[model samples]
Target: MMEKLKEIEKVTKAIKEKILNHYGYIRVITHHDTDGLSSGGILAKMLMRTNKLFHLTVVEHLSKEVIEKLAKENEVNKPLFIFADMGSGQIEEIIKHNFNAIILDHHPPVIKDSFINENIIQLNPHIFGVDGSREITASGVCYLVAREFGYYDLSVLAIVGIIGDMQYNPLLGLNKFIVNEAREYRYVKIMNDIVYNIYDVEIYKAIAYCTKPYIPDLASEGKAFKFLKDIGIDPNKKQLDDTDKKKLLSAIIFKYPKIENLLIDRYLIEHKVRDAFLLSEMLNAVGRNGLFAVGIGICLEDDECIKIGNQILWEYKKNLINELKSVKLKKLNNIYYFEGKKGMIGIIASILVDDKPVIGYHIEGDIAKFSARGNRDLVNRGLNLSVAMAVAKEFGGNGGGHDVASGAVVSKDKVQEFLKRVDEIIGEQ
Candidate 1:
């Protein structure tokens, strides 16, 4: 991993030289999730420190249409295009558009020497045989770039971003380096504790709002208190002792045998934040509401943004709790699926998943978006949702992500066919 990271850093140096010597203004494109927001946020601050001008745009996907739009915008100044948290698989589109770009991302992309020309380049782990999905979040990848430019303090966002990206329900792979860097700088502290935010909320609400363990049925409204009572524990316990926290973990493990790692490290940020998880939830809240500006604000620790982020987190969790109660899922041959709002699809699929994989989708006009997930047991059997999700390309779309969880976007008419292919692949796995 260290060797591959060195290779990644070589490209980071290349990007740095280009940015410092040539580019005067940069146009930034970042995904609208916590990882992407965190990535761009670091670059935003780094650029401002150097007095470099930039424009940042948050996007859901890097479609051909968006690429063409950028191509048109490249009509003047020849500004550098910096893609954060994305633009790996869309290399062909980017090359065709002829935009001078640097992709700072972690997701996989089929690379060839021809694509890595002097005009355009990338810094990613997959090119060096690293398992990007498990190794690090895109935010961590960007942190590597920033560190090369002397922005060591941005590791807070890198840690928080991974928490929001769900890579560190238990930290994995090269993520340890950034997390440890934060620890070294005293930016955050690592605490081994229950996954739920029990300290911030009542034990009942903590269970109800838990996303990592994703307690089935109990995650729904009013079920947590009942489940606790049924298990001989008080539902209204606002402050839990160590024994009580253990009891909660034991109960959830006994009930939901498949959900793994109930106890994990919490990255507690040193600022006015509880931990990386809550800070990440704030970033996720703003991004989930399509407010990337607010997400960036939280990353930069802006006062109003943090205030609004708290309110948004309040509303977001409330809505998710209500939505969890009435979610409808239909089982296919190898997976359970939900067709509804995209916002809650990933959460629903996670909550409902057991042995079989789960797919949650929502069709908006002509486009259908999907979130696919599976268990570690299935992954052990060769289930690769990252490879399977990219099968969207067959239906005029593109998608790929982590192995245990992935997502896709295709034409609405191709939804059934897409699910069929995914089912066939998982059935084979």
Candidate 2:
């Protein structure tokens, strides 16, 4: 891992020199999610230090058409396209268009080489033997770049991206490195949270608004309170001791045999008065609600924007909970699927992903957006949702991400065919 980081350090050093020397303006394109927003804001802060002008655009994914459109719009003096949170998998499209760019991502790279003629530089953890899905995220790579130049304030954003990308339980690989470094600089505080950035809320409220586990009774605080009370936990106590924590865990698992991890390690941002998971959700809400500029502001540390982001998150959670109930789950041979709001699909797919892969979609306008999620058990069983999602390309759409979790977009008319082929690919697995 040390040697791998050294290789990354060498590449980031070069990227630093290039940006400092050539670019008059930077075009930052990132994904429209918590991780992507953090990546964009980190990049913006990194460039702000250089006194270079930069613009940020957040998108759901990086496709060939998106690349073409982005490339055609660049007209700034010595504009350097910096694709964050995404673009490693879309390098072919970037290369085909011959755009001068740097891809700061943690996804598996389509191309192996570091760069070609200094025009396109792709920095990803996967190329260096690190699992991009678990080790680091796009904001992590971008933060590493900023750290190369003595910017430690960006460290908290890295943790936000890690949590937002859903690298659950414990930080791993280079992710641990980021946390250690951030701790050294006093940029983040560890809060051994129960779940979803929580220290200890009322047992009732915890179950009431908790979307991480997506409790079926999220809207019924009385039921949650009664259940905990019946199980020997006091709703008025509002805090769980170790024994109570274990008891609650056992009872919930008994109630939900297929529960995902609820004991999460949360990072508290330095001087920010907020934990990583909550901040990630706020950034995610802004992105999902089409408030990209506000998302960046929250990242750059604007209190007003942060407040607005908080409100957005509240509204987002309310709508998502309502939508999750109405969305119909259609079971295929080896997978299940549903269609809902584009912003809420990923969360729904993630919450529903069991031993079998779950694919959630939202038909917005002319295109069908998708978020495919697979668990470690299924991934160990040889499922690669990344490959399965790529089946969308056959239907004139684009898709690719981590093997266990990925996303895609296809035309609305090709929904059945897209699902049919995706099912076939995963069925083969």
Candidate 3:
């Protein structure tokens, strides 16, 4: 394993050196999820140490329109772009003009050089036959590249992002390479799950806010307490007035099992806690509802993005909570379907449906973006969301993601046919 890691390091170093030698300005754009943030964090730390003027931006997703806008806005010549969690499919667009992009991603690779540019360097596990599974994440990949570039300090940040990405979930397939590397340098401590702590409350809350599919939009409704109340949690009774941090810790630990698991698992004491699966849903909500920037801002911790993140979180909190509570599970063939909050249906679809083959559609203007997630066990069973999405694309819809988790956009008029074809694909699986 160590030898293999060394080889990966060699290639990664070559790539990093090539990137640094060619570009003038640096911009790091990544997803807002745990993997994305950690990946960006690692890159930011490395760039800062190297004295590179690295600007970080968190994106919700990579749509053509969004990509074009970002590309057009970057006026720098020979810009060095490290797109951590995204940009595999957008390589062609990113490299179209003169931009030099190093894509550190984990999503399935595009079949063709949709963007034929010598400046585009794509590094993804799928290229190495690891498909975006629990074994690796965008952050893990970035960490590898960092190692090649001699930036060992960024490993912990990378691990945090990996955890945030839920890549280390359900006791299997943790990115051990990154962990082994970090431990050798003594930067990260691997701990057995232990007694809950307090400082993690807020982080747990953030996790809960992100993972819980039905959270009400706290921004628009200002009803965070109401949602808590429905879940039988009393914010006032929990004693937020006290400066005693331990007291609040006891309150949270005493309140819920799922919540306690989140903090104990991540070793966060004060933040919000949530199921990894649920947080993915909340993230999907941000993307499907056109709140990408808000989601990205929260993850990146950009002051401006943070402000927008808080507003959007509160604004969409109530509606999400109500919708989560109301979804009725429906089964179609092997997949399950549920009526989710309009604000978060696509995200809910991804989780509830798992890998048994499912579709979640969110209508935006004249187009509907269909989000799909698959069962990990069944990905090799010929149930690739990308293949399903390709079917949707045949009808003028565009969609793609990890094999187990993919998405597409279709014209509103083709909803029925899209569903039929998707069902056909799911049925085949």
Candidate 4:
């Protein structure tokens, strides 16, 4: 890890020097998630220090359409493009138009040692013998760049982005180094174990009341009280005394014995395999469907965005409760899907959807894209979704994400073929 850090340090210095000397107009394309935003924030700060002007655009994925649009933009003085938390696959499209480009990311790179100009540089851990699954995220990488340039203000954003990216989980090997380094600077505070919030409490109650996965009595008065008591939560209390709230939240987190199952049941409808996909779709739906500004606005602590988010959350809560009560499984081959709870589906899918006979989902699309979740019971038996996505690219589809929770997008007509091909790819690996 130390050796890896040294490599990162070396690359970051080189990039910083280039930026400081370059006279181009700077712009950043970033993901909208916590990690992505944090990375953007770090980059923005670094650029400000170097007297470079920049603009930030966040997207769900680096879609082909977005690439095309950027390609046509009028060239500006000393033009430079920086992609944060994105652009591993679209490097070709990016380089096709922009002569000066740099991608500071942690995702697997789609193309290697290939760029149009010396202006195009990819600072990725996979290139330098570092694992992204356990290592730092785009934000963490951006933080490294900040460290190289002597900027410390962005550290808080880095930690928030790490937590938002779900990289705080101790199990992922890469997180240890990032977490340790951030701790030394007091830039991040690692909260031990999983933590629950108001949302978790209410969702669990909703599940017990409407759709009982393992629990009995959907919304029964007896079950409601016991559910609350089991988790040491109080359903009647909207607000809690400080100490009691902490204790209750801790207990709720502790009682979610089956993390994935609980996530599915609590956030998604019961017996719905598409829960995770649905949840992710909702987030993507908001972003893709012309509400990214609102999402970012809320993220920036704007009151209007906060109200809008709450309104959306309430509607989602209603839809989830209704869906749980009346869901019919949709089948594609051996895989199952259904209308899922809007918020929890994606997150639950991440945990419950294993690598076997993989399942795929789009937040709001009719067809499913799949990346195999790794195998658990065999040594060297894990399936890589990145490879599956690479193959999917041949079918005019795009898919890639975290190792176990990767995905793809396919035409509705080719859904069946997509599934069959995915299964074959998993076997091939």
Best prediction by TM-score = 1
After superposition, candidate 3 runs with Cα above 4 Å error: 19-23, 61-76, 111-119, 170-174, 184-186, 192-199, 202-264, 267-319, 328-337, 349-429
Error (Å) of candidate 4 at residue 135 is 2.3
Between which residue pairs do clashes occur in model 1?
Answer: none
| lDDT against the true structure, each candidate | 0.79, 0.81, 0.58, 0.57
lDDT of 4 by residue, 155-264 (tens): 55555555556554443544566555655755544432222222333534444433212233333445556766676656655434456445544654444433443332
lDDT of 3: 0.58
- Model 4 has an lDDT value of 0.57
Model 2: lDDT of residue 112: 79
List TM-scores for all candidates, in order.
0.76, 0.73, 0.58, 0.62
TM-score for predicted model 4 compared with the true structure: 0.62
Instruction: List candidate 1 segments past 4 Å from native.
Output: 113-115, 216-239, 246-261, 328-346, 354-374, 377-429
Distance from true location, Cα of 255 in model 3, Å: 13
| Per-residue lDDT of model 1, residues 1-429, tens digit only | 487677777878877777887556798899988888888888898888777889999999988888888888888778899898888889888877788898877777766332377689877777777666777888888788788788888888888778767777457767887888888878887777776652366778877777666666677548888877876777777656687776776777767774346666667776566677778777788888897898888777888988898889878887776686677877788787889785768877876677788889999889998998887778888888988888899889998799877999999999989999888877555
Which structure among the candidates has the greatest lDDT? Answer: 2
After superposition on all CA atoms, what RMSD does each candidate show versus the true structure? 5.5, 5.8, 8.3, 8.7
Superposed Cα RMSD, model 2: 5.8
Off by over 4 Å in 4: 22-24, 48-51, 63-65, 74-78, 111-116, 160-166, 171-174, 198-290, 298-307, 310-325, 329-429
* Candidate 2: residue pairs that collide: none
User: By TM-score, highest first, what's the ranking?
Assistant: 1, 2, 4, 3
TM-score of 1: 0.76
